[PDB]
Amino acid sequence: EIKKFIETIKGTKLFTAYNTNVDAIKYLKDEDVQKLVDEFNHKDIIERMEEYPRIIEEPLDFVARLVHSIKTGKPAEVPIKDDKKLHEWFDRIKYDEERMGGQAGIVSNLMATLQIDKIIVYTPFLSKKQAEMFVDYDNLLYPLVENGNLVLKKVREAYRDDPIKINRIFEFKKGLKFKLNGEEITAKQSTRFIVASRPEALRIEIKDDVRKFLPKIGEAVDCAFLSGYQAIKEEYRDGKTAKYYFERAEEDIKLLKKNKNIKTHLEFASISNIEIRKMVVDYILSNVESVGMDETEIANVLHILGYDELSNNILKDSFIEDVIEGAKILLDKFKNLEVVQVHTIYYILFVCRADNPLSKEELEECLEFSTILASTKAKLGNIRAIDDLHEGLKIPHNKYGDLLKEIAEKFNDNNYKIALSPSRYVEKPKSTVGLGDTISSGAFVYYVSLLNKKRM
């Protein structure tokens, strides 16, 4: 059964862009949080939470948004300003581990670990330290231009004297507790709060040298997993703007498809700036075949598209019926879209049109594979070998499963195909960062694999 999953994906080839970084991870304990809040007047924390800062300019902004994430039990990603004083305050924190971060980095590593035929990863900065966090696999490749020719080089050997990007990941578990202004706050969910660096010099783009060869890169692969748009700023000091990078990124997608119509996937993320979030919808979502979102992310998209009541209902009640309705709206709105994927702590869902070449059972097989990856990663923290997948396979489907599945399954009809795999939930997960990327990329690569297998 693991064998069979691995065989099925082996011939699939993947391009991924644009974001790789170091994720410096802190596993928060009660006392770590208590110490963070005790550095401030508890009243100042409550007042700053009322303001809801969407960018971290001083440590109090961080503490406010972290408490908010713990209290609501919801993940968030919030950018920092680049100043020294703030950067240094964050360095005094003792991190427990460093690992590959960023969608394109995590997905690359996963697919190298799973031993698919080829992975081509692009990111603009590739320092030695960064490159050496990639998995050692001869067919995990980075595109270089040498004497006017495209060279695909093993990523770990392709490094140069580039700067390094570091994001800071604050992981907490269900049951974590602390006191703020007399109130004991207890985490009801295990999740993570991300402090996002957006270094001025690091652009979400393919640089001109490589960009000339995007069509050839597309022909070399079967599909593309794209993300990183979440770090685009409205303005750069050199006068470039979000619009410039978004127009360019939309064109990247057409260039990739120019000589081969590969499947492309957008992975959404928590995007603090609502103007950037809108641009991801307008420029990227409109041009891809697959989209991966959590529940909050689909609500956010729906709100951008003017479906305010449905989006707020999703946020409020998380009814699977409402999520499905939202997915259908996306399918109806975006003709290029073939599959809408939503993942929550309870399930992963695919919504497709009836005309999709895959059957409902084949869609299910994609999701069942993906859930094994995600639960393995939740248990161990990392998927280091194919053999690790036996961990995920031991964990049973969560107790809401038959029920969620039953509800969703009734929306299969003449117009739409729906598949749902309940999560295989682990009470005390080692970590949560990258679980979505793991599930989304697994499901998508499996989907592409089954399409191509059927086409022959």
Ligand X SMILES: OC[C@H]1O[C@H](O)[C@H](O)[C@@H](O)[C@@H]1O
Ligand Y SMILES: Nc1ncnc2c1c(I)cn2[C@@H]1O[C@H](CO)[C@@H](O)[C@H]1O
Residues in the chain: 456
Helix orientation angle between 84-91 and 59-72, rounded to the nearest 10 degrees: 50
C-alpha to C-alpha distance for 401 and 419, rounded to whole angstroms:
12
Q: How far is CA 270 from CA 9, 123, 294, 298, in A?
A: 29, 20, 9, 11
Token output for 301: 């998209």
The minimum distance between CB 434 and ligand Y, in angstroms, equals 9
The minimum distance between CB 371 and ligand Y, in angstroms, equals 5
* Residues in the annotated binding site for Mg(2+): 267, 297, 437
Determine the size of the site formed for ligand X (CB under 6 A). Answer: 16
Per DSSP bridges, beta strands 166-172 and 223-226 are: unpaired
* Residues in the annotated binding site: 267, 297, 437
Per CB under 6 A, 23 contacts ligand X? yes
- Return the residue of 79, 143, 436, 442 that touches Mg ion, per CB under 5 A: 436
Site for ligand X in 245-274 (CB under 6 A): 269
Active site residue 388: no
The minimum distance between CB 352 and ligand Y, in angstroms, equals 18
The minimum distance between CB 398 and ligand Y, in angstroms, equals 8
* Binding pattern for the stretch 115-154 against ligand X, x by CB under 6 A and - elsewhere: ----------------------------------------
Q: Under DSSP, is residue 230 helix (H, G, I), strand (E, B) or coil? A: helix
Choose the binding region for ligand X from 95-103, 237-245, 277-285, 319-327 (rule: CB under 6 A): 95-103
Choose the binding region for ligand Y from 37-45, 201-209, 270-278, 340-348 (rule: CB under 6 A): 340-348
C-alpha to C-alpha distance for 94 and 28, rounded to whole angstroms:
10
C-alpha to C-alpha distance for 418 and 328, rounded to whole angstroms:
10
C-alpha to C-alpha distance for 233 and 236, rounded to whole angstroms:
7
**For the stretch 216-236, what's the b/e string if a residue is b when 16 or more beta carbons lie within 10 angstroms of its beta carbon?**
ebbebbbbbbbbbbbbbbeeb
The minimum distance between CB 66 and ligand Y, in angstroms, equals 17
Per CB under 6 A, 167 contacts ligand X? yes
Determine the size of the site formed for Mg ion (CB under 5 A). Answer: 1
Choose the binding region for ligand X from 47-55, 319-327, 391-399, 431-439 (rule: CB under 6 A): 431-439
**Do 437 and 1 form a contact (C-beta atoms < 8 A)?**
no
Per CB under 6 A, 423 contacts ligand Y? yes
Per CB under 6 A, 77 contacts ligand X? yes
C-beta of 190 vs 290, nearer to ligand Y: 190
* Binding pattern for the stretch 359-378 against ligand Y, x by CB under 6 A and - elsewhere: ------------x--xx--x
| Closest alpha carbon to 383 in 372, 367, 394, 368 | 372
| Closest alpha carbon to 170 in 375, 28, 369, 380 | 28
**Do 61 and 85 form a contact (C-beta atoms < 8 A)?**
no
**Which of Mg ion, ligand Y, ligand X, none does residue 33 bind to, with CB < 5 to 8 Å depending on kind?**
none
Query: Which parts of this chain interact with Mg ion (CB under 5 A)?
Result: 436
Query: Which parts of this chain interact with ligand X (CB under 6 A)?
Result: 21, 23, 77, 101-103, 106, 167, 194, 196, 230, 269, 433-434, 436-437
| Residue numbers annotated as active site | 437
